[PDB]
Amino acid sequence: PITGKVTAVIGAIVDVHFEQSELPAILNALEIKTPQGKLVLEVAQHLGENTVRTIAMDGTEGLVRGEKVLDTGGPISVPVGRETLGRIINVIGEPIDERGPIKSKLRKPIHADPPSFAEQSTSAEILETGIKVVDLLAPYARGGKIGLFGGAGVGKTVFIQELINNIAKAHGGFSVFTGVGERTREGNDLYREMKETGVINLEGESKVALVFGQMNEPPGARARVALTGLTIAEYFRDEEGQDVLLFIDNIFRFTQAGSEVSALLGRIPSAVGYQPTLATDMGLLQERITTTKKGSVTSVQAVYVPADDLTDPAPATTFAHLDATTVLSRGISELGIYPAVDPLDSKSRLLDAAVVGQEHYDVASKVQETLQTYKSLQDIIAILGMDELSEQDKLTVERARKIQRFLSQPFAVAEVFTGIPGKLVRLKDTVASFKAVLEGKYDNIPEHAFYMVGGIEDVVAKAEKLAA
Amino acid sequence: NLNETGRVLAVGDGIARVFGLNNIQAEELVEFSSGVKGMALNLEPGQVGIVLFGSDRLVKEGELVKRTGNIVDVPVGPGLLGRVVDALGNPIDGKGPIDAAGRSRAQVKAPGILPRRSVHEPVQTGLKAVDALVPIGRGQRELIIGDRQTGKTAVALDTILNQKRWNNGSDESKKLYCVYVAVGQKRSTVAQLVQTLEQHDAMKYSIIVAATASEAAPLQYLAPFTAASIGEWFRDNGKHALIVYDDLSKQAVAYRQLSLLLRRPPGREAYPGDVFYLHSRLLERAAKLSEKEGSGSLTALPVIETQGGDVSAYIPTNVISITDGQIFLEAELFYKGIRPAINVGLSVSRVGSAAQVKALKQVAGSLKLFLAQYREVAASAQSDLDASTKQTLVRGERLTQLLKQNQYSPLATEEQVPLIYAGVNGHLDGIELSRIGEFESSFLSYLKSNHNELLTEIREKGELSKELLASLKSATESFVAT
Amino acid sequence: ANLNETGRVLAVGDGIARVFGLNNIQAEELVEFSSGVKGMALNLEPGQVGIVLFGSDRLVKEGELVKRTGNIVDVPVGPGLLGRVVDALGNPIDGKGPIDAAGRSRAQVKAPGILPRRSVHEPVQTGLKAVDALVPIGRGQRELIIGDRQTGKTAVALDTILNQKRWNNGSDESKKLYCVYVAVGQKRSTVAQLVQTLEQHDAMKYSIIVAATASEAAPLQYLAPFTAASIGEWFRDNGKHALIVYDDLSKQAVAYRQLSLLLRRPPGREAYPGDVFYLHSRLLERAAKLSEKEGSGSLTALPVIETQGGDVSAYIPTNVISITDGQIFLEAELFYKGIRPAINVGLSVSRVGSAAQVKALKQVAGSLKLFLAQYREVAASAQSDLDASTKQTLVRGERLTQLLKQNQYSPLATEEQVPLIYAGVNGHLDGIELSRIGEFESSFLSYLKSNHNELLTEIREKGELSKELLASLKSATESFVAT
Ligand SMILES: Nc1ncnc2c1ncn2[C@@H]1O[C@H](COP(=O)(O)OP(=O)(O)NP(=O)(O)O)[C@@H](O)[C@H]1O
Ligand SMILES: Nc1ncnc2c1ncn2[C@@H]1O[C@H](COP(=O)(O)OP(=O)(O)NP(=O)(O)O)[C@@H](O)[C@H]1O
Ligand SMILES: [Mg+2]
């Protein structure tokens, strides 16, 4: 049991002195016992003279110079395994749901090396998501990272939950949701909603692990939580072999936290006031989300854009790692289209002949082409009346309106809020379904047959029930 | 001695660097020879850095300093209602000692994830624009933000005034106790505020916590957390407190003073890396507690002053993202006579409908819409426009005018909904734009003499049935014709 | 404990270790810590040395022993690295075992002086219609690939490497071009995937990968391009030719900035140190074409820079432009329209390559440089009059714009290129629609191969257009177009 003594407390920075070379490695978790419970520090630097500088994971009010400090012998560790599913967990792996100890048998460090260059899967590949818009038009990369855009009131939470659900049923992979700087009020919402939707099931089996680093916690805590959430996600890949979803809400709050820790550590700020380690801080998180030979952790990360300036060093660094974006728009929502994904805005590196095959690409590029003139044609149809359209134009526009509505879809999780049955359309259907519509094989169907239905057979089934 | 005492090594700029005090707690309070107090923010090997609560002309090198053994606490309890206190809870209003239920610390763990419930009960501000378009619920943190002199205090203040409607009742679950934090303001400004509350008989349910412009930086820094704990007594005991932090711009300035003078590292705009943590620590304490935990709530109106409307500044950024929405005020609108000068298209309450009386939600549904469509077609307001656009323009002008309101005159919900209804539904179209004010006044009094039944139902039921709606429709046209 | 050969750690933080002893150490000597992690003696001071780490700070504690190495920062070099993937210090990362080194070169090697150089005159064939015709690169040149995120920068360099398969299978050693690709700051998976592409096109056997990826320590990223140039230099100094892609320098500069600020060097413009120019300039000066006496070798550099919001005037862009011998600028606007390669010709230039261009291309590139980037005069104005004269250049312009398009992974031989351009410049496309210029090109090359292969062969073997071949080429062109 290796002991030290607090020698300094300056806000969330705490210095501790030790005995000769009994010094904790940088990134070790240290512990002080407080009457609150216990305070964790993470070793940041070796200052010299057997003194190390640390970052606090909780408040430091009340500390006294000379107080004992215990070395854990390693980095912050977190429980891993199925006993984390359906539970709420903080940055230091403690349960914060008043539901008792995470009776997990193993624990792993949050700091760890990425899969080796040799361990790296060598061919990019689609993660089929069960969602038309995404699969067809902006498919997710397996072991990739995806930027989720647009703030609130666009069904982000239902969209995330549908993903947790589609992945677990279609690929039997679990999810980990990391609220990085999560607003306590909103975490409490999410938890209640997850129970209501089924994805957490306290009396049964849960599909998702919740890890929260709330806004009222010190930067140290907010910077590390992502890695907490990620470690749990890695265990499902490395030991259970699954294709795993990792949600990070919000990735910008990870950056800002490290900006703040860096500032407390005395480091001279870089451009725009971000930490000089902005890119490596980002790399140390991202490079761990990838496809090994065992599985993949794939991550859906919510991205805030400061000043709506996309060249700002935070998005700019983030974007470097993003394989796709899903752009949720109120403008798509206010036309009653659910999920409110924007088909023109949402983009993927993998919408590519080589990755998805020549079919998939061709179908999607036409859909894209179609919707594109229809967008510019919103301008003349608003002035010239409808009739003023040319032969191929008045058709594709009648058929665009038809595509634009076929991009809707009922979510199995929305079911409880809606009563409409939910549909997980396989990518296979999604491709043909859209190819056929584009070829004119369904022009003689009224638009409403296309709204809130799964695969083509439901456009068929629906239109026959509208008939009487 | 040295475990319990210290020698002043150096003093200057409200920083006392102190030798000894080897057993002191971080953030613990100290006492000096001359009697000036301070708190120990920097614990270092050689020394302790103490920030002073009073003029440092009172401190000298060599001077003796004692521990008090206490982290900053503050008295809390109902006995503070009607009182005006400094940041440590000393009475400053000449009304005698303050009776305390007990004492809470300045810094308190915000309620966790689990002991909460979704925001649902409204904080009725009395302000048509807010209650109709940017509704606030008990537990929520809603930011009042804008450039100087745009009406920010006024929004907070009409809100506090409006709580007379329940704070004179007997049903503790409906009452809303009020805490107002004056950070960095001038004393005569706090004095005049007090007088206003006194005149409208709102002091009885309010507590003023004042750390004004001449007061040492620590006290301005502390005042919010300290007021927060005062608020929390209500929350922890099955009641509902509203806390206004007027304002957080000035509190961030105070903390920056301390940090720069303690030589902690500076960052953007010279703020310390823990200025986000200061405000989030502070603001997560507003909360809507679970049924197990008593259903208490604390609702926060932090104020932020922007400079040139730049919400990307360091402190507004921090606070915009911590909170649940923005009420955005603007000089432009203000000068046009739109008061409160709320910019609808920039204001939001992420909570939204869940916190609105159902009646107001019923009539306002479309208000959100017409006004949205209004400010889109605005540049058209300057001859040739189809009857579609002429209409859109007619409507919006009037709905805008309906949202003007005098200061110190908050409206009951049952007074708000019929006014909003008339507009929303086109009963104001044929009425020249200058007469919308006198219309509101006359129409209200007419409903009060002739239709007290409709108003009583709106108030007592909170929803509008198709019978209420139909009744409302008739009574309106009735008046508009007349 | 010898304090001459050995040291004790005083402190470690911010990527620096402060070390006591090592009295015999040289400035910039590599050192070894207990954990096996390596470092570089950066600043020797009375009573201590400051060592920059090539790994995480976790891997070094206070009180630990540090061993001298004897060696200034260096790397393995030689033809034995071919087919191999290594880290910035030369360590294999490809699962394949110890590197087979002809010897070791320092990371920092001085540039060839004023004397040992000769003007570039030998083509680096990219196989990209737009680059070979309009921004010809010569062996020994430095040409910047610059543009925003996701604009095809890497594609342009990678097609160039894939294209070398043409000569690196022959015997004639002078026509061959070995390839060093440097990944600095990229995702491990990007690079893994890149290497698999290279393997699949059988390009890997003549290329070397040097990777310092996103999660690695800033100094490893700072260093990679330098150790990659010495690897590249071996070919140069031994009468052979090497192409080096620095993908990308923007990220190298960022890493360097990380190191300088933690070293507490004063932030300048955009927070970069004063020496961020010297960072690139010394690196890139090492590209060269050597004299007869120095064996005639060459190292050609293709550094990649990433603009933000398309601004080529930022500090780092202009620094590199003031070093290299030209730029290939890629516009995000063209890229989104489907014009790929999205080479903005107005803003692209090769300062020395014209000499080294294959004559055939030079001959059918008559003014194409001037004309095209000037059709841009009319084009921008077009959308005030339905003119007569300037309606022609709008139709030719549009055609050459499609001719310049090109699919990825499909680099094309010179003799496959010159006909397409001849057929464009002389207006044989004027009548054909836009949507068919794509199909025209594939079908036209088939026709040429089967029926007029004698002529392609002549273009390939002499590289010129004799009046007769010029006239014969006119013949075959007119025929196909008519049908
Ligand atoms: N609804 C209203 N109608 C008319 N006048 C108003 C209204 N609200 C506020 N005012 C006046 O406008 C001025 C600014 O309001 P105030 O509440 O002081 O804003 P503020 O943003 O706190 N300004 P300051 O704190 O001084 O930067 C005061 O003189 C108010 O009396
Ligand atoms: N000539 C081409 N024709 C068609 N598609 C292309 C071409 N070149 C590149 N692409 C595609 O366009 C995307 C961007 O190309 P890439 O070469 O990755 O550019 P980059 O500037 O290096 N992007 P990054 O480095 O990730 O910011 C890739 O998905 C390519 O597959
Ligand atoms: Mg004010």
Ligand SMILES: [Mg+2]
């Ligand atoms: Mg690239």
